Protein backbone atom coordinates (compact mmCIF):
# COMPACT_ATOMS: atom_id res chain seq x y z
CA UNK A 1 0.00 0.00 0.00
CA UNK A 2 1.00 3.63 -0.33
CA UNK A 3 1.28 6.29 2.33
CA UNK A 4 -1.36 9.10 2.29
CA UNK A 5 0.16 12.58 2.16
CA UNK A 6 -2.12 15.07 4.03
CA UNK A 7 -1.92 18.79 3.42
CA UNK A 8 -1.78 21.02 6.52
CA UNK A 9 -2.56 24.73 6.24
CA UNK A 10 -0.06 26.72 8.29
CA UNK A 11 2.27 25.70 11.08
CA UNK A 12 -0.24 24.77 13.76
CA UNK A 13 -1.93 22.29 11.41
CA UNK A 14 1.55 21.07 10.35
CA UNK A 15 2.43 20.30 14.01
CA UNK A 16 -0.77 18.34 14.48
CA UNK A 17 -0.22 16.50 11.22
CA UNK A 18 3.29 15.57 12.29
CA UNK A 19 1.86 14.06 15.55
CA UNK A 20 -0.69 12.13 13.54
CA UNK A 21 2.03 10.91 11.13
CA UNK A 22 4.25 9.66 14.02
CA UNK A 23 1.27 7.90 15.64
CA UNK A 24 0.16 6.36 12.32
CA UNK A 25 3.66 4.76 11.82
CA UNK A 26 3.83 7.00 8.71
CA UNK A 27 0.77 5.57 7.08
CA UNK A 28 -0.05 9.31 6.90
CA UNK A 29 2.63 11.87 6.17
CA UNK A 30 2.44 15.67 5.85
CA UNK A 31 2.93 18.39 3.33
CA UNK A 32 2.25 21.95 4.42
CA UNK A 33 1.30 25.15 2.64
CA UNK A 34 0.42 28.68 3.81
CA UNK A 35 -3.13 28.78 2.58
CA UNK A 36 -5.91 26.32 1.63
CA UNK A 37 -5.68 27.32 -2.04
CA UNK A 38 -1.94 26.48 -1.96
CA UNK A 39 -2.79 23.01 -0.42
CA UNK A 40 -5.35 22.53 -3.26
CA UNK A 41 -2.51 23.25 -5.76
CA UNK A 42 -0.20 20.70 -3.99
CA UNK A 43 -2.92 18.08 -4.35
CA UNK A 44 -3.50 19.03 -8.04
CA UNK A 45 0.23 18.60 -8.66
CA UNK A 46 0.20 15.23 -6.90
CA UNK A 47 2.53 16.51 -4.15
CA UNK A 48 -0.12 15.90 -1.54
CA UNK A 49 -3.09 13.54 -1.53
CA UNK A 50 -5.90 15.12 0.45
CA UNK A 51 -7.17 17.63 3.00
CA UNK A 52 -10.48 18.44 4.62
CA UNK A 53 -12.21 21.53 3.23
CA UNK A 54 -15.02 24.02 3.88
CA UNK A 55 -17.63 23.90 1.09
CA UNK A 56 -16.43 27.19 -0.51
CA UNK A 57 -12.97 25.63 -0.88
CA UNK A 58 -14.59 22.36 -2.17
CA UNK A 59 -15.97 24.55 -4.96
CA UNK A 60 -12.50 25.84 -5.86
CA UNK A 61 -11.02 22.28 -5.59
CA UNK A 62 -13.94 20.73 -7.56
CA UNK A 63 -13.63 23.20 -10.45
CA UNK A 64 -10.03 21.82 -10.74
CA UNK A 65 -11.04 18.21 -10.70
CA UNK A 66 -10.76 17.12 -7.11
CA UNK A 67 -13.57 14.98 -5.66
CA UNK A 68 -15.25 14.60 -2.24
CA UNK A 69 -14.15 11.48 -0.34
CA UNK A 70 -15.71 11.51 3.22
CA UNK A 71 -17.59 14.20 5.07
CA UNK A 72 -17.43 15.49 8.65
CA UNK A 73 -20.39 14.23 10.70
CA UNK A 74 -21.01 15.92 14.00
CA UNK A 75 -23.38 14.60 16.70
CA UNK A 76 -26.94 14.45 15.30
CA UNK A 77 -29.80 16.36 16.92
CA UNK A 78 -32.04 13.26 16.51
CA UNK A 79 -31.21 9.78 17.86
CA UNK A 80 -30.00 7.34 15.30
CA UNK A 81 -29.24 3.61 15.47
CA UNK A 82 -26.86 3.97 12.44
CA UNK A 83 -23.08 3.92 12.95
CA UNK A 84 -21.62 7.47 12.58
CA UNK A 85 -19.84 6.43 9.38
CA UNK A 86 -23.17 5.52 7.75
CA UNK A 87 -25.38 8.18 9.28
CA UNK A 88 -26.51 10.85 6.71
CA UNK A 89 -24.78 14.33 7.21
CA UNK A 90 -26.98 17.22 8.34
CA UNK A 91 -25.56 20.58 7.10
CA UNK A 92 -24.59 23.26 9.62
CA UNK A 93 -26.32 26.58 10.10
CA UNK A 94 -24.55 29.73 8.83
CA UNK A 95 -25.51 32.62 11.12
CA UNK A 96 -24.74 36.31 11.70
CA UNK A 97 -23.94 36.97 15.36
CA UNK A 98 -23.84 40.30 17.21
CA UNK A 99 -23.68 41.41 20.81
CA UNK A 100 -27.05 41.84 22.63
CA UNK A 101 -25.65 45.15 23.98
CA UNK A 102 -25.33 46.44 20.42
CA UNK A 103 -28.98 47.13 20.47
CA UNK A 104 -29.65 48.88 17.25
CA UNK A 105 -28.04 46.41 14.93
CA UNK A 106 -30.05 44.22 12.60
CA UNK A 107 -29.46 42.58 9.19
CA UNK A 108 -30.84 45.78 7.62
CA UNK A 109 -28.44 48.11 9.24
CA UNK A 110 -25.14 46.27 8.58
CA UNK A 111 -23.93 48.85 6.11
CA UNK A 112 -20.87 50.67 7.38
CA UNK A 113 -20.46 48.40 10.35
CA UNK A 114 -17.33 46.32 11.30
CA UNK A 115 -17.43 42.64 10.30
CA UNK A 116 -15.58 39.48 11.23
CA UNK A 117 -15.42 36.63 8.65
CA UNK A 118 -13.84 33.17 8.86
CA UNK A 119 -11.96 33.78 5.55
CA UNK A 120 -12.72 34.88 1.98
CA UNK A 121 -14.20 32.04 -0.05
CA UNK A 122 -15.56 30.03 2.97
CA UNK A 123 -19.28 29.20 3.27
CA UNK A 124 -20.63 30.81 6.44
CA UNK A 125 -17.84 33.36 6.66
CA UNK A 126 -18.09 34.74 3.17
CA UNK A 127 -20.04 33.10 0.30
CA UNK A 128 -23.42 33.09 2.08
CA UNK A 129 -23.33 36.57 3.71
CA UNK A 130 -21.56 38.37 0.86
CA UNK A 131 -23.67 36.57 -1.75
CA UNK A 132 -26.85 37.80 0.11
CA UNK A 133 -25.43 41.32 0.51
CA UNK A 134 -24.43 41.65 -3.20
CA UNK A 135 -27.90 40.48 -4.16
CA UNK A 136 -29.80 42.74 -1.73
CA UNK A 137 -27.73 45.84 -2.47
CA UNK A 138 -27.64 45.11 -6.26
CA UNK A 139 -23.94 45.88 -6.19
CA UNK A 140 -20.68 43.91 -6.60
CA UNK A 141 -18.86 46.50 -4.46
CA UNK A 142 -19.03 44.21 -1.40
CA UNK A 143 -15.49 45.39 -0.50
CA UNK A 144 -16.98 48.73 0.42
CA UNK A 145 -20.07 47.56 2.32
CA UNK A 146 -18.62 47.23 5.80
CA UNK A 147 -16.46 50.11 7.06
CA UNK A 148 -13.69 47.71 8.19
CA UNK A 149 -13.45 43.92 8.38
CA UNK A 150 -11.25 40.95 9.15
CA UNK A 151 -11.69 38.70 6.09
CA UNK A 152 -8.51 36.54 5.94
CA UNK A 153 -7.30 36.18 2.39
CA UNK A 154 -8.27 39.62 1.27
CA UNK A 155 -5.68 42.35 0.37
CA UNK A 156 -3.88 43.11 3.66
CA UNK A 157 -3.83 46.84 3.01
CA UNK A 158 -7.58 46.97 2.29
CA UNK A 159 -10.45 47.70 4.59
CA UNK A 160 -11.38 43.98 4.37
CA UNK A 161 -8.23 43.23 6.42
CA UNK A 162 -8.19 46.28 8.68
CA UNK A 163 -9.42 44.44 11.73
CA UNK A 164 -7.21 41.44 11.32
CA UNK A 165 -4.43 41.12 13.94
CA UNK A 166 -1.88 38.62 12.65
CA UNK A 167 0.14 36.41 14.97
CA UNK A 168 1.68 36.91 18.43
CA UNK A 169 4.19 39.33 16.84
CA UNK A 170 1.74 41.01 14.56
CA UNK A 171 3.18 39.31 11.40
CA UNK A 172 0.99 37.53 8.86
CA UNK A 173 -1.96 39.96 9.32
CA UNK A 174 -4.94 38.65 7.33
CA UNK A 175 -3.31 35.40 6.20
CA UNK A 176 -5.98 32.72 5.87
CA UNK A 177 -4.54 30.30 8.29
CA UNK A 178 -4.67 29.71 12.10
CA UNK A 179 -1.65 32.06 12.73
CA UNK A 180 -4.05 34.97 12.14
CA UNK A 181 -5.76 35.61 15.52
CA UNK A 182 -9.15 36.19 13.91
CA UNK A 183 -9.06 33.31 11.37
CA UNK A 184 -11.71 30.65 11.00
CA UNK A 185 -14.82 30.03 13.02
CA UNK A 186 -13.26 30.56 16.39
CA UNK A 187 -11.11 33.55 15.27
CA UNK A 188 -14.13 35.36 13.72
CA UNK A 189 -16.23 34.68 16.85
CA UNK A 190 -13.28 36.00 19.01
CA UNK A 191 -13.26 39.16 16.74
CA UNK A 192 -16.86 39.68 17.80
CA UNK A 193 -16.33 38.63 21.48
CA UNK A 194 -13.55 41.25 21.83
CA UNK A 195 -15.73 43.97 20.08
CA UNK A 196 -13.22 44.30 17.31
CA UNK A 197 -16.18 43.74 14.98
CA UNK A 198 -19.92 44.42 15.22
CA UNK A 199 -20.94 41.18 13.50
CA UNK A 200 -19.37 37.73 13.01
CA UNK A 201 -20.30 35.39 10.12
CA UNK A 202 -19.84 31.91 11.60
CA UNK A 203 -22.01 28.87 12.26
CA UNK A 204 -24.38 28.09 15.02
CA UNK A 205 -22.08 25.54 16.67
CA UNK A 206 -19.31 28.10 17.09
CA UNK A 207 -21.34 30.30 19.39
CA UNK A 208 -22.31 27.34 21.65
CA UNK A 209 -18.89 25.80 21.69
CA UNK A 210 -17.13 28.98 22.88
CA UNK A 211 -19.55 30.23 25.54
CA UNK A 212 -20.85 29.18 29.01
CA UNK A 213 -17.64 27.37 29.84
CA UNK A 214 -17.61 25.11 26.79
CA UNK A 215 -14.25 26.64 26.00
CA UNK A 216 -11.57 27.19 28.70
CA UNK A 217 -9.51 29.37 26.40
CA UNK A 218 -8.70 32.72 27.91
CA UNK A 219 -10.77 34.90 25.57
CA UNK A 220 -13.75 32.56 25.63
CA UNK A 221 -13.77 31.21 29.16
CA UNK A 222 -15.90 34.04 30.46
CA UNK A 223 -18.38 34.59 27.59
CA UNK A 224 -22.12 34.03 28.16
CA UNK A 225 -24.44 33.04 25.36
CA UNK A 226 -27.05 35.39 26.60
CA UNK A 227 -24.74 38.32 25.66
CA UNK A 228 -25.16 37.37 21.94
CA UNK A 229 -27.94 37.59 19.38
CA UNK A 230 -28.45 36.21 15.87
CA UNK A 231 -29.46 38.50 13.00
CA UNK A 232 -32.40 36.99 11.00
CA UNK A 233 -32.97 37.89 7.32
CA UNK A 234 -36.40 39.37 8.20
CA UNK A 235 -34.59 42.04 10.20
CA UNK A 236 -35.39 40.60 13.69
CA UNK A 237 -32.81 39.59 16.37
CA UNK A 238 -33.08 36.30 18.27
CA UNK A 239 -31.36 34.46 21.07
CA UNK A 240 -28.81 32.00 19.92
CA UNK A 241 -31.21 29.14 20.89
CA UNK A 242 -33.23 30.05 17.77
CA UNK A 243 -30.72 29.33 15.03
CA UNK A 244 -33.14 26.85 13.30
CA UNK A 245 -35.39 29.85 12.63
CA UNK A 246 -32.75 32.59 12.30
CA UNK A 247 -29.94 31.48 9.94
CA UNK A 248 -28.63 32.68 6.67
CA UNK A 249 -28.34 29.25 5.07
CA UNK A 250 -27.74 25.63 5.70
CA UNK A 251 -24.13 24.77 4.60
CA UNK A 252 -22.81 21.42 3.37
CA UNK A 253 -20.43 19.91 5.97
CA UNK A 254 -16.71 20.27 5.53
CA UNK A 255 -15.33 17.22 3.67
CA UNK A 256 -12.15 15.56 2.53
CA UNK A 257 -11.14 15.96 -1.13
CA UNK A 258 -8.53 14.26 -3.24
CA UNK A 259 -7.63 13.56 -6.78
CA UNK A 260 -9.94 11.15 -8.29
CA UNK A 261 -7.42 8.35 -8.71
CA UNK A 262 -6.38 8.51 -5.10
CA UNK A 263 -9.88 8.76 -3.57
CA UNK A 264 -10.40 5.12 -2.89
CA UNK A 265 -7.07 4.73 -1.09
CA UNK A 266 -7.52 8.01 0.88
CA UNK A 267 -10.98 6.74 1.91
CA UNK A 268 -9.72 3.35 3.13
CA UNK A 269 -6.80 4.87 5.02
CA UNK A 270 -8.99 7.49 6.74
CA UNK A 271 -11.59 4.90 7.82
CA UNK A 272 -8.78 3.00 9.49
CA UNK A 273 -7.12 6.05 10.91
CA UNK A 274 -10.34 7.22 12.64
CA UNK A 275 -10.89 3.70 14.00
CA UNK A 276 -7.56 4.33 15.82
CA UNK A 277 -7.68 8.08 16.57
CA UNK A 278 -11.29 9.14 16.15
CA UNK A 279 -13.94 9.84 18.76
CA UNK A 280 -13.77 6.76 21.05
CA UNK A 281 -10.95 5.43 18.78
CA UNK A 282 -8.65 2.62 19.96
CA UNK A 283 -5.91 5.10 20.69
CA UNK A 284 -7.86 8.23 21.63
CA UNK A 285 -7.43 9.74 24.14
CA UNK A 286 -4.36 7.76 25.31
CA UNK A 287 -2.13 8.39 22.35
CA UNK A 288 -3.68 10.79 19.85
CA UNK A 289 -7.12 12.23 18.95
CA UNK A 290 -7.53 13.20 15.26
CA UNK A 291 -10.66 15.41 16.02
CA UNK A 292 -9.19 17.46 18.93
CA UNK A 293 -6.96 20.51 18.78
CA UNK A 294 -7.87 22.56 21.93
CA UNK A 295 -10.83 24.26 20.13
CA UNK A 296 -8.69 25.41 17.31
CA UNK A 297 -10.33 23.16 14.60
CA UNK A 298 -7.01 22.08 13.19
CA UNK A 299 -7.27 19.65 10.16
CA UNK A 300 -10.83 18.84 11.18
CA UNK A 301 -13.43 20.67 13.28
CA UNK A 302 -13.20 19.70 16.91
CA UNK A 303 -16.89 18.80 16.93
CA UNK A 304 -16.34 16.00 14.36
CA UNK A 305 -17.71 12.68 15.64
CA UNK A 306 -16.42 10.82 12.53
CA UNK A 307 -15.76 11.10 8.82
CA UNK A 308 -18.77 9.56 7.09
CA UNK A 309 -19.28 7.83 3.82
CA UNK A 310 -20.98 9.72 1.09
CA UNK A 311 -24.18 8.53 -0.54
CA UNK A 312 -24.32 8.25 -4.30
CA UNK A 313 -20.60 8.72 -5.10
CA UNK A 314 -21.33 12.36 -5.50
CA UNK A 315 -19.61 14.87 -7.68
CA UNK A 316 -18.54 18.10 -6.01
CA UNK A 317 -21.63 19.86 -7.35
CA UNK A 318 -23.91 17.10 -6.03
CA UNK A 319 -22.16 17.27 -2.64
CA UNK A 320 -22.40 21.10 -2.38
CA UNK A 321 -25.91 21.21 -3.91
CA UNK A 322 -27.00 22.96 -7.02
CA UNK A 323 -28.41 26.01 -5.27
CA UNK A 324 -25.18 26.62 -3.32
CA UNK A 325 -23.00 26.16 -6.42
CA UNK A 326 -25.12 28.65 -8.40
CA UNK A 327 -24.91 31.14 -5.39
CA UNK A 328 -21.11 30.86 -5.43
CA UNK A 329 -20.84 31.22 -9.16
CA UNK A 330 -23.17 34.33 -8.94
CA UNK A 331 -20.98 35.94 -6.29
CA UNK A 332 -17.73 35.11 -8.19
CA UNK A 333 -19.05 37.18 -11.14
CA UNK A 334 -18.17 40.20 -9.04
CA UNK A 335 -14.46 39.39 -9.05
Amino acid sequence: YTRVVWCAVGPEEQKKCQQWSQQSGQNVTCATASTTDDCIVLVLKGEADALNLDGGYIYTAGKCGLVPVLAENRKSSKHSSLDCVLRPTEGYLAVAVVKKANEGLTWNSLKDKKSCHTAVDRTAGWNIPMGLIVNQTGSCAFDEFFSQSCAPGADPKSRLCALCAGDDQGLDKCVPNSKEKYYGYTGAFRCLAEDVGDVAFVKNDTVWENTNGESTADWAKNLKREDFRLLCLDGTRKPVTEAQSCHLAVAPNHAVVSRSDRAAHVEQVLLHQQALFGKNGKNCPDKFCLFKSETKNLLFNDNTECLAKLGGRPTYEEYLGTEYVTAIANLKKCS
Binding site: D37, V41, L44, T60, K63, C64, A329, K332
Partner: peptide
Protein backbone atom coordinates in the same frame (compact mmCIF):
# COMPACT_ATOMS: atom_id res chain seq x y z
CA UNK B 1 -19.72 27.81 -15.74
CA UNK B 2 -15.98 28.47 -15.50
CA UNK B 3 -12.79 26.41 -15.23
CA UNK B 4 -10.03 25.85 -12.67
CA UNK B 5 -8.68 29.01 -10.90
CA UNK B 6 -5.07 27.83 -11.10
Amino acid sequence: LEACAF
